[PDB]
Every structure is written in C-alpha cells, then in structure tokens.
Amino acid sequence: RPRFSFSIAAREGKARTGTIEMKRGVIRTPAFMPVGTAATVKALKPETVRATGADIILGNTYHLMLRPGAERIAKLGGLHSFMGWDRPILTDSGGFQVMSTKQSEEGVTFKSHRHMLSPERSIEIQHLLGSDIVMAFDECTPYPATPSRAASSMERSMRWAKRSRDAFDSRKEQAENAALFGIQQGSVFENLRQQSADALAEIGFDGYAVGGLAGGEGQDEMFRVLDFSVPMLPDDKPHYLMGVGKPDDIVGAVERGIDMFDCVLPTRSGRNGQAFTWDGPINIRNARFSEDLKPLDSECHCAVCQKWSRAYIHHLIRAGEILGAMLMTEHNIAFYQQLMQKIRDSISEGRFSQFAQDFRARYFA
Amino acid sequence: RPRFSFSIAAREGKARTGTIEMKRGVIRTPAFMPVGTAATVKALKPETVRATGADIILGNTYHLMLRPGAERIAKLGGLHSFMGWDRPILTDSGGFQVMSTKQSEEGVTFKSHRHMLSPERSIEIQHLLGSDIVMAFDECTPYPATPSRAASSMERSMRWAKRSRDAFDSRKEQAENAALFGIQQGSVFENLRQQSADALAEIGFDGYAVGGLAGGEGQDEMFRVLDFSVPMLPDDKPHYLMGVGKPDDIVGAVERGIDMFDCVLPTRSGRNGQAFTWDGPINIRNARFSEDLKPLDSECHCAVCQKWSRAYIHHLIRAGEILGAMLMTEHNIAFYQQLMQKIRDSISEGRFSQFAQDFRARYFA
Ligand SMILES: [Zn+2]
Ligand SMILES: [Zn+2]
C-alpha cells in the first residue's frame, strides 16, 4: 500500500464515496472514526471496535501527552502497539483540549488539569505516538467571534499550518509513512473561509479539515457555513468535519461534501444511557424500558442487539455496572458504522438523496 | 443430562476430582465459580467468562431481589435468559448480605441499602431466578462467637435447613430441575460442626457447604476447622467452601476435601489493580510497571496476556479506564480457572501433593 491515496468511486451531487489507502489499511469514506481518549476507545477492546466496522480511530494528543506521555509511548513501541490497534490512527493536534494558559505566536503554555504546545511540538508528539494521519496545529476560534478576531485567529492558524507542514516534512520517517491534514478556519465568514482555503491549498496537504464548527452555532448555521466552505477545499482530497457528531448532522454534512467525521457522542452517550436507533435516540434508563424484551434497535446487526434486551441494559445502566457501558458503547458505535455503510452504499447506487429523506422521516417521526 | 449427578474420577488423600452433571451442563471439580453481582460478572460478557474456563457462576440473591427484582426477572424469562449465561448458576440464599434488620425464628426483615427474607421466601426467590443450585437459608454466625451463641445459631440454621428442604420439595418444577445444598455451621467448635453435619445428612441434600469461615479467623484456624469438619460431610456429595478465595486458601482447602469455591477477590481485586501471577499477586498501579512490556503473567494462557503489556494495563488502571477493569478481571478469572485446571490434572495424575508444594514454593518465593 502507498503512504496515502484517496480515490473517489462514486458521486451524487456534492456527496462522494471512495477509499483512502494507507500503509496500515484502507479507510472507506464517508468514514466515522471512534474516539480513543487515553489510548482506549472507552469500554471496548480494539477487536470489538474493528468488529463494528471501524476502519480508523482518532487518538487525542492532549490526553496522551499528559498520560502516559508521548516519549513513554514511543519508548514502548508507539500507540498502535501500546493499545493493540494495528489499523490507521488519526491524531488531533492537542490544541483544542488545551483551550477546553498563556497563548502567543510561538504556541501555548498550559497547566495539566506545566506544559507547552507549539506547531513543532504538536507534530513531534504525533510522530512519537506513531500517528498515520497527523493534524496541523491551529488556534481555536470560539463561537461566536467577531470578524476581526476570527480573521486574526485564522491568519495565525495559516501561519501555524505552514509551520506544521515544515515540521512534518523535516522528519523523514514521518513524511514517508504518515499523512498531514490542514485545518480551515474563519468562523462563519465566507471571505475568511475562502482566504483560509486558499492558504491551505497553496501550502498543500493530504486532506483538509473544516475546523471551528460544532461550537454552539446550531445545525442550520453549521450547514449554511458548510454550503460555501466545503467547495473551497480541493475536491480531490478528503474533507474532514471535526467534532461532528449527531446522525442527522452527519447525513447533512455528507450531502455537503464531507468525507470524515469523529465525535465522542456515541461513546459518551452510551455510558450516559442514550442509545441510537433508526427511530431516534432513546434513553435506556427510562422506566418504560424496564420490562422491554426487544433489542436496543429492531434492525441493528450488532452483537448487543443479537444477544441482550433493553430490559437487561436498562438494569445494567441503572445499577452503574461496567457491562452496561460496554454494551451501550458497542451498540452505539456499531450503529454509527451501519449509518456510514448505508450512506456509502446509497451514494454508490445513486440513491443517497432518497436515503437522506427516508432517514430524516423516520429518525424524526 | 440428569438433574444432578456427582461422580468422583480420582482421589489423592482427602482431595477429589470429578464432575457434577446437571441439565444445563457439566461442572468440573474442584471448581471455581466467578461471582455475578447484579446479574453480571463485573466487566465481562458471559462469553468471556466462559472463554476463561468457568463452568458455572454464582448469582447473589440479595442484590437481585432488590435490583431488578426476583419477580421481574421471572417475568422476563429467568436469570439465564436475562443475563445471557446458559450454563449452571448457583445462587446464594441472600441472607449473608442482609447481615453485611430485625431477626427472628421466622426470618429477617430489613431495609434496602423494607424487605423480608425467610427460608421459604429465599427458596422462592431462587426459584423465580431459575437457579440450578439453590442454597438453603441459614443464619450467619459472626467470628468470633461464643460456644453458646454458635450453638444457638447452628441449631436455628438446622431448623431453617429443614424448612428450606421442604420449601424446595414443595415446588415441583424446582425439585425436578434444580439441586439443593445445605450449609454446615458451628463456628470453630468440633462438636457443633458434628451436630450440624449429622442434622444436614439426616435431612439429605445434593451437596454440603461449609459455612461460617473466611470471617476473620485467619488461614491456620480455617484450615484446622476444615481438618475436622469436611470429613463429617457425606463423602459422596460435593463440598462447597463458601466465600473462599485466595489461591493458597483454595489449594489448602482442596487438600482438605473441598470441591467448590467462590469469591469476589479476582473480580474486585482486578478493578483495584491487583493481578494474580504464579509468583504471587502484583499491584499493576505500581510505578515499577509503567514501562514493563511483559504480560501480567509470563505463563498465563489468557487473551489479555496474549495481547497487552503490564505497561498498558498500568496506564489504564491509573487513568480509571473501563478497559483496565475489563482486562484485569478477565486475566484474574482466567488465572483462577488455570489454577483449578492444574489442581484437577494433578489430582487425576496422583501428583497433587507435589503440585501444592511447588505452587507454594513459587507463589511465596
Ligand atoms: Zn445494536
Ligand atoms: Zn493472563
């Protein structure tokens, strides 16, 4: 396999389906990436994450650099070996969670909840972890942001994108074996989104993320910004919408040209009692499920829906049992993978617009 | 398969190995029974509990009757169906955890941490859960106990053993499909142990538990009491030592004629960071393991020791991650099953005394 090859197999309007080939495996797009916080997808062994259909997971740089430490993970063989996941890993840059502190043009210094993160250090940590898809280090633009602040922050992020590119390229083993994605900023402002897209394409990346959304703006606004923002990115490279999340957000974002997603929702939701179904989310802790012998979802093909009832899962979550977290998280990540598979097949078959309409009619019935 | 058949295949001194055949499966003895509290072996799917080699698990009556409720579990199809374990389940009587309240000769009334438990109600709950091995309801004798108190309590327990026998026999489906074990009491006093054994054998049970030990008396005392107590039980029925536990306690107890064990140690220990090894227990949270790439135990055949290092498990437990509990509990229960398998093979081969000596020399090196 090549270091990185994105191929588009089918299109329907702005939606695309295809594959990213990398040394550790093929990623089917549109893709959903389960999030590994602290070198684990919560409550799942890697083999179970793979069994749900995930082709790649996301590792959070911020957490790893605090615990267990990036240099420590490198000494032990890298993140893949440490956690037992041998397929591609995308790592974030660590900066978002820094904000979630002294900031300057060099980078940010912060106290662990004393550390430093610059574009160079972020790319180095992602190298030490052995990441396959490395994210450029950007500056977070809060929502809402004034035009002036959004512009200053976008400009700093483009300076840091060039620094990230040069740091990644300076390290032979990383340049030869991993891919580097740039992140578009500009808040909700079309002209800044355009300047950001132009700058990132001038520098050149393997893929392009749409940053700064899912920050409180609401779905209509998010979709309006995607409407003009995604077409500004190079068409022939993957488009990654960072931190997006809800099933309906994913369907609308695919309709607008997005190829990759991550979110903690299905894992975090799981442990909190929220289960996704084709008829909308349910909260399994609700007393109405205490004697319900049906599976979480009537159509879901996951091992949890094969084997255990809503009533059992209700009891486990109400009792605070670990197996309740395990079962809820496996089902929710399987549900997301089945959604992505339905999206991919419907685009491949030229019936994605109908699928989106059918999905919305039922999910919101 | 028959309702209940215990066959002894080999003996070495007081140690025996053999099988209990029941309708839901065969139990290899000496047996260790993982404990399911609240209708789950903590942090393990049933298929994983089975993969470790367990032939039967223990369900705690007290917890189940509070949450989710015995009548509720019966309405949903019984405990096997509810939790997805289709092999034998032994249920305790619920009384111990009641103590762990108004007591009388009829039974005990208590407030959930308002309920009632008598011999009749306990046998009924175990029926509603669909237990395969039902324990008679006894009265707990605290350690230490005076001779007079231990005698009064033992006598009450023998009265309740007859009540348990008659309640179990009055229910056709339970009498035909499950087995009933009696519990010997008498604290540390030989004459009371003998009177208790005589009473239980007069009533007649499918198996006999040694109750009231592992209550603070220490291993030398426990072993001294087993020395005279176990020979008082019918030789041709299984002998169950309730709530025993540590690997060395199990080896010594088998040397004294015990065939069945349960304890929360390997599960509870797991989540707390204690991992069993042939060289003794380790606490994985210790900093000495932070860069240790060896598996938890160098000889262990479990899936955790195949796949993950001490360093990774150290990180997961220190980070409070669910997968750390999952991996530690799977390894510890697998370790217990491998211990029982080594015990069974060594008795079968007439080399159990040597095995016990070799085990002690290394476990305590
Ligand atoms: Zn499911
Ligand atoms: Zn092991």
Author numbering:
A (entry chain A), B (entry chain A): 11 to 110, 115 to 127, 132 to 383
Paper quotes:
Also the electron density maps of the Tgt(Val233Gly)·queuine and Tgt(Cys158Val/Val233Gly)·queuine complex structures enabled reliable placement of the 7-deazaguanine scaffold of the ligand which is, in both cases, similarly bound as in the Tgt(Cys158Val)·queuine complex. In both maps fragmentary density is visible for the dihydroxy-cyclopentenyl substituent (7H as well as 8F, 8H). Figures 7F and 7H show that the mutation of Val233 to glycine results in a considerable gain of space in the substrate binding pocket which allows the dihydroxy-cyclopentenyl of queuine to occupy the cavity located between Gly233 and the side chain of Cys/Val158. Within this cavity the dihydroxy-cyclopentenyl apparently has no specific interaction with the protein. As a consequence, it seems to be highly flexible which is reflected by the ill-defined electron density assigned to this moiety in both structures. The crystal structures of Tgt(Val233Gly) and Tgt(Cys158Val/Val233Gly) with queuine reveal that the Val233Gly exchange allows the dihydroxy-cyclopentenyl substituent to occupy the created cavity between position 233 and 158. The adopted binding mode of queuine will not interfere sterically with the sugar-phosphate backbone of bound tRNA. Yet, the results of the trapping experiment suggest that Tgt(Val233Gly) is also not able to bind queuine after the formation of the covalent enzyme·tRNA complex. It must be noted that in the case of all queuine complex structures determined in this study the electron density assigned to the 7-deazaguanine scaffold of the ligand by far does not comply with the nominal resolution of the respective structure. Even in the case of the mutated variants where reliable placement of the scaffold into the binding pocket was possible the electron density within this area appears rather fuzzy or even patchy and lacks detail. It is likely that multiple conformations and the low occupancy (on average 60%) of queuine in the binding pocket provoked the poor electron density.
Transfer RNA–guanine transglycosylase (Tgt, EC 2.4.2.29) catalyses the exchange of a specific guanine base in tRNA molecules by a substituted 7-deazaguanine. Bacterial Tgt functions as a homodimer in which the protomer consists of a (βα)8 barrel harbouring a Zn2+ binding subdomain close to the C-terminus. The reaction follows a ping-pong mechanism including a covalent Tgt⋅tRNA intermediate. Hence, in an attempt to generate a model system for the active site of human Tgt and to gain insights into the relevance of particular amino acids for substrate base selectivity, we adapted the Z. mobilis Tgt active site by site-directed mutagenesis in order to mimic that of the human enzyme.
